[PDB]
Amino acid sequence: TTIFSPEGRLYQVEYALESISHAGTAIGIMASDGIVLAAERKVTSTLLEQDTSTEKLYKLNDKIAVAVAGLTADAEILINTARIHAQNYLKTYNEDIPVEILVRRLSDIKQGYTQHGGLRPFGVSFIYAGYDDRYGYQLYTSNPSGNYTGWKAISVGANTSAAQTLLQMDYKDDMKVDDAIELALKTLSKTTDSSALTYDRLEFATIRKGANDGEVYQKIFKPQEIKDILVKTGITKKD
Template identity: 65%
Template structure:
Protein backbone atom coordinates (compact mmCIF):
# COMPACT_ATOMS: atom_id res chain seq x y z
CA UNK A 1 0.00 0.00 0.00
CA UNK A 2 2.76 2.44 0.88
CA UNK A 3 4.24 2.25 -2.63
CA UNK A 4 1.34 4.33 -3.92
CA UNK A 5 2.25 7.20 -1.61
CA UNK A 6 6.01 7.09 -1.07
CA UNK A 7 7.20 8.30 -4.49
CA UNK A 8 7.12 11.95 -3.39
CA UNK A 9 7.84 13.70 -0.13
CA UNK A 10 4.75 15.88 -0.50
CA UNK A 11 2.19 13.06 -0.84
CA UNK A 12 0.24 12.12 2.26
CA UNK A 13 -1.06 8.57 2.69
CA UNK A 14 -4.73 8.07 3.66
CA UNK A 15 -3.53 7.70 7.26
CA UNK A 16 -1.88 11.13 7.10
CA UNK A 17 1.68 9.81 7.01
CA UNK A 18 4.68 10.99 4.98
CA UNK A 19 6.50 7.79 4.16
CA UNK A 20 9.70 9.47 2.97
CA UNK A 21 10.11 11.04 6.42
CA UNK A 22 9.53 7.67 8.05
CA UNK A 23 12.12 6.06 5.77
CA UNK A 24 14.63 8.71 6.85
CA UNK A 25 13.92 7.91 10.50
CA UNK A 26 14.40 4.22 9.76
CA UNK A 27 17.83 4.97 8.28
CA UNK A 28 18.74 6.75 11.52
CA UNK A 29 17.71 3.73 13.59
CA UNK A 30 20.54 1.73 11.98
CA UNK A 31 23.21 4.38 12.60
CA UNK A 32 25.70 4.54 15.44
CA UNK A 33 24.25 5.52 18.81
CA UNK A 34 24.51 9.13 19.97
CA UNK A 35 23.73 10.17 23.55
CA UNK A 36 23.26 13.58 25.13
CA UNK A 37 23.10 14.23 28.87
CA UNK A 38 22.39 17.56 30.58
CA UNK A 39 24.30 18.26 33.81
CA UNK A 40 24.27 21.14 36.26
CA UNK A 41 27.67 22.41 35.14
CA UNK A 42 27.61 21.46 31.47
CA UNK A 43 26.43 19.06 28.78
CA UNK A 44 27.91 15.75 27.58
CA UNK A 45 27.58 14.23 24.10
CA UNK A 46 28.86 10.72 23.42
CA UNK A 47 28.75 8.79 20.16
CA UNK A 48 29.66 5.49 18.57
CA UNK A 49 31.93 5.68 15.54
CA UNK A 50 31.21 3.26 12.70
CA UNK A 51 34.36 3.98 10.66
CA UNK A 52 37.28 2.43 12.54
CA UNK A 53 40.77 1.78 11.25
CA UNK A 54 44.22 1.63 12.77
CA UNK A 55 45.32 4.01 10.02
CA UNK A 56 43.02 6.80 11.19
CA UNK A 57 44.39 9.64 13.31
CA UNK A 58 41.78 9.16 16.01
CA UNK A 59 42.10 12.57 17.66
CA UNK A 60 41.59 14.39 14.34
CA UNK A 61 38.94 12.27 12.62
CA UNK A 62 35.64 13.30 14.19
CA UNK A 63 32.82 11.47 12.47
CA UNK A 64 29.91 12.05 14.87
CA UNK A 65 30.48 15.22 16.93
CA UNK A 66 30.85 18.70 15.42
CA UNK A 67 31.18 22.18 16.99
CA UNK A 68 28.56 24.53 15.50
CA UNK A 69 29.60 27.77 17.17
CA UNK A 70 31.45 28.95 20.24
CA UNK A 71 28.56 27.95 22.49
CA UNK A 72 27.09 24.92 20.68
CA UNK A 73 28.16 21.43 19.67
CA UNK A 74 26.12 18.67 18.02
CA UNK A 75 26.22 14.89 17.76
CA UNK A 76 24.77 13.26 14.65
CA UNK A 77 23.18 9.89 13.93
CA UNK A 78 22.52 8.87 10.34
CA UNK A 79 24.05 9.80 7.01
CA UNK A 80 27.26 11.71 7.68
CA UNK A 81 27.14 13.44 4.27
CA UNK A 82 23.70 14.87 5.09
CA UNK A 83 25.01 15.87 8.52
CA UNK A 84 27.92 17.76 6.95
CA UNK A 85 25.50 19.86 4.91
CA UNK A 86 23.41 20.72 7.97
CA UNK A 87 26.48 21.44 10.10
CA UNK A 88 27.81 23.87 7.49
CA UNK A 89 24.42 25.60 7.32
CA UNK A 90 24.29 25.94 11.11
CA UNK A 91 27.85 27.28 11.27
CA UNK A 92 27.09 29.91 8.63
CA UNK A 93 23.91 30.97 10.46
CA UNK A 94 25.79 31.24 13.76
CA UNK A 95 28.59 33.29 12.22
CA UNK A 96 26.14 35.68 10.52
CA UNK A 97 24.41 36.25 13.86
CA UNK A 98 27.76 36.82 15.58
CA UNK A 99 28.79 39.32 12.90
CA UNK A 100 25.51 41.25 13.15
CA UNK A 101 24.96 41.28 16.92
CA UNK A 102 28.49 40.70 18.27
CA UNK A 103 27.38 37.82 20.48
CA UNK A 104 26.80 34.09 20.06
CA UNK A 105 23.43 33.01 18.71
CA UNK A 106 21.04 31.72 21.43
CA UNK A 107 20.98 27.93 21.44
CA UNK A 108 17.29 27.35 20.72
CA UNK A 109 17.27 30.00 18.00
CA UNK A 110 20.02 28.16 16.12
CA UNK A 111 18.22 24.84 16.56
CA UNK A 112 14.99 26.37 15.25
CA UNK A 113 16.80 27.85 12.24
CA UNK A 114 18.23 24.45 11.34
CA UNK A 115 14.90 22.69 11.87
CA UNK A 116 13.15 25.18 9.57
CA UNK A 117 15.52 24.07 6.83
CA UNK A 118 14.90 20.39 7.58
CA UNK A 119 11.14 20.89 7.57
CA UNK A 120 11.33 22.68 4.22
CA UNK A 121 12.81 19.55 2.66
CA UNK A 122 9.59 17.68 3.53
CA UNK A 123 7.21 19.99 1.65
CA UNK A 124 8.77 20.59 -1.77
CA UNK A 125 8.80 18.17 -4.68
CA UNK A 126 12.13 16.92 -5.95
CA UNK A 127 13.71 16.97 -2.49
CA UNK A 128 14.13 14.30 0.15
CA UNK A 129 14.38 14.65 3.94
CA UNK A 130 17.83 14.72 5.51
CA UNK A 131 18.58 11.22 6.77
CA UNK A 132 20.10 12.40 10.03
CA UNK A 133 19.06 13.18 13.60
CA UNK A 134 20.99 15.73 15.64
CA UNK A 135 21.50 16.11 19.36
CA UNK A 136 22.53 19.67 20.26
CA UNK A 137 24.32 20.86 23.38
CA UNK A 138 24.30 24.62 23.91
CA UNK A 139 24.63 27.43 26.39
CA UNK A 140 23.34 30.99 26.48
CA UNK A 141 22.69 33.56 29.17
CA UNK A 142 18.91 33.29 28.70
CA UNK A 143 18.40 29.63 29.59
CA UNK A 144 21.82 28.34 30.67
CA UNK A 145 22.85 24.87 29.54
CA UNK A 146 20.44 23.21 27.11
CA UNK A 147 20.05 19.90 25.29
CA UNK A 148 17.90 19.47 22.18
CA UNK A 149 17.05 16.61 19.83
CA UNK A 150 15.71 17.02 16.27
CA UNK A 151 14.64 14.50 13.63
CA UNK A 152 14.24 14.60 9.80
CA UNK A 153 10.72 16.04 10.03
CA UNK A 154 12.05 19.26 11.56
CA UNK A 155 10.56 18.62 15.00
CA UNK A 156 12.77 19.44 17.96
CA UNK A 157 12.41 19.28 21.72
CA UNK A 158 14.43 19.96 24.86
CA UNK A 159 15.67 17.08 27.01
CA UNK A 160 17.51 16.24 30.21
CA UNK A 161 18.91 13.13 28.53
CA UNK A 162 18.25 11.75 25.06
CA UNK A 163 19.64 9.41 22.41
CA UNK A 164 19.39 8.57 18.72
CA UNK A 165 20.56 5.77 16.47
CA UNK A 166 20.77 2.02 16.89
CA UNK A 167 19.44 0.48 20.12
CA UNK A 168 17.93 3.82 21.12
CA UNK A 169 15.18 1.96 23.00
CA UNK A 170 17.73 0.26 25.24
CA UNK A 171 19.63 3.52 25.74
CA UNK A 172 16.47 5.44 26.60
CA UNK A 173 15.46 2.81 29.16
CA UNK A 174 18.88 2.97 30.84
CA UNK A 175 18.87 6.76 30.87
CA UNK A 176 15.44 6.78 32.53
CA UNK A 177 16.70 4.44 35.23
CA UNK A 178 20.05 6.09 35.96
CA UNK A 179 19.66 9.78 35.17
CA UNK A 180 19.39 12.00 38.26
CA UNK A 181 18.77 15.71 38.56
CA UNK A 182 21.83 17.55 39.79
CA UNK A 183 24.38 15.37 38.00
CA UNK A 184 27.79 16.88 37.29
CA UNK A 185 29.57 16.61 33.95
CA UNK A 186 31.93 13.97 35.36
CA UNK A 187 28.96 11.87 36.51
CA UNK A 188 27.27 12.36 33.14
CA UNK A 189 30.41 11.17 31.34
CA UNK A 190 30.35 7.97 33.40
CA UNK A 191 26.64 7.44 32.68
CA UNK A 192 27.16 7.99 28.94
CA UNK A 193 30.01 5.46 28.91
CA UNK A 194 27.90 2.85 30.73
CA UNK A 195 24.94 3.34 28.40
CA UNK A 196 27.16 3.03 25.33
CA UNK A 197 28.61 -0.20 26.70
CA UNK A 198 25.06 -1.62 26.68
CA UNK A 199 24.11 -0.35 23.23
CA UNK A 200 27.39 -1.69 21.81
CA UNK A 201 26.62 -5.00 23.51
CA UNK A 202 30.07 -5.22 25.06
CA UNK A 203 31.65 -4.62 28.44
CA UNK A 204 35.13 -3.98 26.98
CA UNK A 205 35.38 -0.81 24.92
CA UNK A 206 38.23 1.27 23.53
CA UNK A 207 38.59 4.82 22.25
CA UNK A 208 38.74 3.72 18.58
CA UNK A 209 34.95 3.25 18.55
CA UNK A 210 33.89 6.23 20.64
CA UNK A 211 33.71 10.01 20.63
CA UNK A 212 33.02 12.21 23.65
CA UNK A 213 32.55 15.96 23.93
CA UNK A 214 31.74 18.29 26.80
CA UNK A 215 30.41 21.83 26.93
CA UNK A 216 31.26 23.79 30.06
CA UNK A 217 31.93 27.33 31.20
CA UNK A 218 35.27 28.75 32.19
CA UNK A 219 35.60 28.90 35.97
CA UNK A 220 33.39 31.56 37.51
CA UNK A 221 32.02 32.81 34.17
CA UNK A 222 28.37 33.19 33.16
CA UNK A 223 28.62 34.76 29.70
CA UNK A 224 28.03 32.62 26.61
CA UNK A 225 31.40 33.68 25.25
CA UNK A 226 32.97 31.77 28.15
CA UNK A 227 31.52 28.44 26.93
CA UNK A 228 34.21 25.90 26.19
CA UNK A 229 33.74 22.91 23.88
CA UNK A 230 36.15 20.07 24.51
CA UNK A 231 36.44 17.10 22.15
CA UNK A 232 38.06 14.40 24.26
CA UNK A 233 41.25 12.79 23.00
CA UNK A 234 41.80 9.03 22.73
CA UNK A 235 43.89 9.08 25.90
CA UNK A 236 41.14 10.88 27.83
CA UNK A 237 38.50 8.45 26.60
CA UNK A 238 40.63 5.45 27.56
CA UNK A 239 41.15 6.98 31.01
CA UNK A 240 37.39 7.45 31.39
CA UNK A 241 36.69 3.85 30.36
CA UNK A 242 39.34 2.53 32.76
CA UNK A 243 37.87 4.55 35.64
CA UNK A 244 34.49 2.87 35.08
CA UNK A 245 35.97 -0.59 34.42
CA UNK A 246 34.80 -0.59 30.80
CA UNK A 247 38.17 -0.52 29.05
CA UNK A 248 39.38 -3.40 26.92
CA UNK A 249 42.14 -5.36 28.59
CA UNK A 250 45.49 -5.63 26.86
CA UNK A 251 45.36 -9.45 26.91
CA UNK A 252 41.84 -9.66 25.50
Protein backbone atom coordinates in the same frame (compact mmCIF):
# COMPACT_ATOMS: atom_id res chain seq x y z
CA THR B 1 7.89 12.09 -3.90
CA THR B 2 6.36 14.04 -0.92
CA ILE B 3 2.74 12.83 -1.04
CA PHE B 4 0.70 11.72 1.98
CA SER B 5 -0.14 8.12 2.84
CA PRO B 6 -3.99 7.83 3.24
CA GLU B 7 -3.54 8.05 7.05
CA GLY B 8 -2.05 11.59 6.64
CA ARG B 9 1.60 10.48 7.08
CA LEU B 10 4.66 11.01 4.82
CA TYR B 11 6.23 7.88 3.28
CA GLN B 12 9.58 9.56 2.59
CA VAL B 13 9.94 10.76 6.21
CA GLU B 14 9.17 7.24 7.45
CA TYR B 15 11.82 5.78 5.06
CA ALA B 16 14.37 8.43 6.15
CA LEU B 17 13.53 7.44 9.78
CA GLU B 18 14.16 3.72 8.85
CA SER B 19 17.56 4.80 7.44
CA ILE B 20 18.65 6.64 10.64
CA SER B 21 17.44 3.69 12.81
CA HIS B 22 20.58 1.82 11.56
CA ALA B 23 22.97 4.78 11.77
CA GLY B 24 25.04 4.32 15.01
CA THR B 25 24.03 5.37 18.56
CA ALA B 26 24.55 8.77 20.24
CA ILE B 27 23.77 9.81 23.88
CA GLY B 28 23.59 13.34 25.38
CA ILE B 29 23.20 14.19 29.12
CA MET B 30 22.62 17.62 30.75
CA ALA B 31 24.32 17.89 34.18
CA SER B 32 23.75 20.78 36.65
CA ASP B 33 27.09 22.37 35.52
CA GLY B 34 27.72 21.01 31.97
CA ILE B 35 26.58 18.90 28.97
CA VAL B 36 28.07 15.56 27.86
CA LEU B 37 27.86 14.16 24.30
CA ALA B 38 28.98 10.62 23.37
CA ALA B 39 28.64 8.58 20.15
CA GLU B 40 29.43 4.99 19.11
CA ARG B 41 31.22 4.59 15.80
CA LYS B 42 31.23 1.31 13.77
CA VAL B 43 34.93 1.00 12.86
CA THR B 44 34.75 -2.20 10.72
CA SER B 45 37.73 -0.82 8.71
CA THR B 46 41.34 -1.14 10.01
CA LEU B 47 42.68 1.24 7.33
CA LEU B 48 40.11 3.98 8.03
CA GLU B 49 41.91 6.85 9.75
CA GLN B 50 40.92 6.85 13.39
CA ASP B 51 42.43 9.98 14.99
CA THR B 52 40.70 11.90 12.20
CA SER B 53 39.48 15.05 13.97
CA THR B 54 35.67 14.49 13.54
CA GLU B 55 33.00 12.12 12.24
CA LYS B 56 29.95 11.97 14.60
CA LEU B 57 30.65 15.04 16.80
CA TYR B 58 31.08 18.65 15.52
CA LYS B 59 31.42 22.29 16.73
CA LEU B 60 28.78 24.77 15.44
CA ASN B 61 30.34 27.76 17.27
CA ASP B 62 32.41 28.49 20.46
CA LYS B 63 29.60 27.16 22.82
CA ILE B 64 27.50 24.73 20.64
CA ALA B 65 28.18 21.12 19.58
CA VAL B 66 26.23 18.34 17.79
CA ALA B 67 26.19 14.58 17.54
CA VAL B 68 25.05 12.99 14.24
CA ALA B 69 23.07 9.87 13.55
CA GLY B 70 22.37 9.46 9.80
CA LEU B 71 24.25 10.20 6.56
CA THR B 72 27.41 12.27 7.24
CA ALA B 73 27.18 13.71 3.70
CA ASP B 74 23.70 15.13 4.54
CA ALA B 75 24.77 16.24 8.04
CA GLU B 76 27.73 18.31 6.79
CA ILE B 77 25.42 20.49 4.56
CA LEU B 78 23.22 21.33 7.58
CA ILE B 79 26.29 21.76 9.87
CA ASN B 80 27.80 24.40 7.53
CA THR B 81 24.45 26.21 7.26
CA ALA B 82 24.26 26.30 11.09
CA ARG B 83 27.89 27.56 11.36
CA ILE B 84 27.11 30.35 8.83
CA HIS B 85 23.92 31.30 10.81
CA ALA B 86 25.80 31.30 14.16
CA GLN B 87 28.47 33.70 12.82
CA ASN B 88 25.87 35.85 10.99
CA TYR B 89 23.97 36.22 14.30
CA LEU B 90 27.23 37.06 16.14
CA LYS B 91 28.07 39.62 13.40
CA THR B 92 24.58 41.22 13.66
CA TYR B 93 24.02 41.24 17.46
CA ASN B 94 27.66 41.16 18.74
CA GLU B 95 26.45 38.25 20.95
CA ASP B 96 26.77 34.47 20.82
CA ILE B 97 23.75 32.62 19.23
CA PRO B 98 21.09 31.21 21.67
CA VAL B 99 20.81 27.42 21.34
CA GLU B 100 17.02 27.36 20.65
CA ILE B 101 17.34 29.81 17.72
CA LEU B 102 19.97 27.59 15.99
CA VAL B 103 18.48 24.10 16.77
CA ARG B 104 15.05 25.18 15.34
CA ARG B 105 16.84 26.93 12.40
CA LEU B 106 18.12 23.48 11.24
CA SER B 107 14.60 22.06 12.00
CA ASP B 108 13.02 24.61 9.53
CA ILE B 109 15.43 23.68 6.65
CA LYS B 110 14.83 19.94 7.21
CA GLN B 111 11.03 20.39 7.07
CA GLY B 112 11.35 22.16 3.66
CA TYR B 113 13.16 19.13 2.12
CA THR B 114 10.03 17.06 3.15
CA GLN B 115 7.37 19.27 1.45
CA HIS B 116 8.71 19.87 -2.12
CA GLY B 117 8.69 16.78 -4.36
CA GLY B 118 11.96 17.61 -6.17
CA LEU B 119 13.88 17.23 -2.88
CA ARG B 120 14.52 14.06 -0.89
CA PRO B 121 14.52 14.73 2.91
CA PHE B 122 17.77 14.68 4.94
CA GLY B 123 18.60 11.34 6.58
CA VAL B 124 19.95 12.97 9.82
CA SER B 125 19.15 13.15 13.55
CA PHE B 126 21.02 15.73 15.68
CA ILE B 127 21.47 15.77 19.51
CA TYR B 128 22.44 19.50 19.95
CA ALA B 129 24.31 20.80 23.07
CA GLY B 130 25.30 24.29 24.31
CA TYR B 131 25.19 27.14 26.80
CA ASP B 132 23.66 30.61 26.71
CA ASP B 133 22.56 33.21 29.34
CA ARG B 134 18.84 33.06 28.26
CA TYR B 135 18.43 29.46 29.63
CA GLY B 136 21.76 27.86 30.72
CA TYR B 137 22.96 24.37 29.65
CA GLN B 138 20.48 23.09 27.00
CA LEU B 139 20.10 19.65 25.36
CA TYR B 140 17.88 19.34 22.23
CA THR B 141 17.09 16.68 19.57
CA SER B 142 15.97 17.12 15.92
CA ASN B 143 15.07 14.43 13.31
CA PRO B 144 14.35 14.02 9.49
CA SER B 145 10.75 15.30 9.95
CA GLY B 146 11.84 18.75 11.24
CA ASN B 147 10.48 17.95 14.75
CA TYR B 148 12.60 19.16 17.68
CA THR B 149 12.34 18.60 21.45
CA GLY B 150 14.09 19.61 24.72
CA TRP B 151 15.59 16.86 26.95
CA LYS B 152 17.57 16.27 30.18
CA ALA B 153 19.04 13.10 28.66
CA ILE B 154 18.45 11.55 25.19
CA SER B 155 19.67 8.93 22.73
CA VAL B 156 19.34 8.93 18.89
CA GLY B 157 20.04 6.44 16.09
CA ALA B 158 20.34 2.70 16.72
CA ASN B 159 19.28 1.15 20.09
CA THR B 160 17.38 4.32 21.21
CA SER B 161 14.84 2.31 23.28
CA ALA B 162 17.30 0.38 25.47
CA ALA B 163 19.31 3.61 25.99
CA GLN B 164 16.23 5.70 27.01
CA THR B 165 15.31 3.05 29.64
CA LEU B 166 18.89 3.01 31.06
CA LEU B 167 19.02 6.86 31.16
CA GLN B 168 15.62 7.11 32.89
CA MET B 169 16.45 5.01 35.94
CA ASP B 170 19.94 6.51 36.67
CA TYR B 171 19.42 10.21 35.74
CA LYS B 172 19.16 12.76 38.64
CA ASP B 173 18.37 16.49 38.26
CA ASP B 174 21.22 17.52 40.67
CA MET B 175 24.11 15.43 39.15
CA LYS B 176 27.54 16.94 38.23
CA VAL B 177 29.38 16.75 34.84
CA ASP B 178 31.66 13.92 36.09
CA ASP B 179 28.51 11.90 37.01
CA ALA B 180 27.21 12.52 33.47
CA ILE B 181 30.64 11.30 32.08
CA GLU B 182 30.16 8.10 34.06
CA LEU B 183 26.49 7.73 33.11
CA ALA B 184 26.98 8.24 29.34
CA LEU B 185 29.88 5.73 29.25
CA LYS B 186 27.89 3.19 31.35
CA THR B 187 24.81 3.63 29.13
CA LEU B 188 26.78 3.05 25.90
CA SER B 189 28.56 0.00 27.41
CA LYS B 190 25.07 -1.29 28.48
CA THR B 191 23.69 -0.59 24.91
CA THR B 192 26.56 -1.42 22.46
CA ASP B 193 26.40 -4.06 19.70
CA SER B 194 30.20 -4.38 19.91
CA SER B 195 31.61 -6.65 22.62
CA ALA B 196 33.07 -3.83 24.72
CA LEU B 197 33.56 -0.08 24.41
CA THR B 198 37.04 1.34 23.49
CA TYR B 199 38.52 4.79 22.72
CA ASP B 200 38.40 4.59 18.86
CA ARG B 201 34.81 3.26 18.71
CA LEU B 202 33.85 6.17 21.00
CA GLU B 203 33.50 9.88 20.12
CA PHE B 204 33.21 12.10 23.25
CA ALA B 205 32.88 15.81 24.22
CA THR B 206 31.82 18.06 27.19
CA ILE B 207 30.49 21.65 27.70
CA ARG B 208 31.85 22.58 31.19
CA LYS B 209 32.43 26.01 32.89
CA GLY B 210 36.01 25.52 34.22
CA ALA B 211 37.51 27.68 37.04
CA ASN B 212 37.14 31.22 35.55
CA ASP B 213 33.76 32.97 35.81
CA GLY B 214 33.36 34.10 32.16
CA GLU B 215 34.36 30.72 30.63
CA VAL B 216 32.39 28.01 28.91
CA TYR B 217 34.65 25.43 27.27
CA GLN B 218 33.95 22.71 24.69
CA LYS B 219 36.58 19.99 24.87
CA ILE B 220 35.90 17.64 21.96
CA PHE B 221 38.08 14.91 23.37
CA LYS B 222 41.15 13.60 21.53
CA PRO B 223 41.63 9.79 21.79
CA GLN B 224 44.11 9.95 24.70
CA GLU B 225 41.71 12.03 26.87
CA ILE B 226 38.93 9.48 26.14
CA LYS B 227 41.28 6.69 27.28
CA ASP B 228 41.60 8.55 30.64
CA ILE B 229 37.82 8.84 31.26
CA LEU B 230 37.53 5.17 30.19
CA VAL B 231 40.14 4.00 32.77
CA LYS B 232 38.75 6.28 35.52
CA THR B 233 35.10 5.17 34.97
CA GLY B 234 35.68 1.42 35.51
CA ILE B 235 35.07 0.58 31.83
CA THR B 236 38.86 0.44 32.07
CA LYS B 237 40.13 -1.68 29.16
CA LYS B 238 43.58 -1.30 30.82
CA ASP B 239 46.88 -3.29 31.09
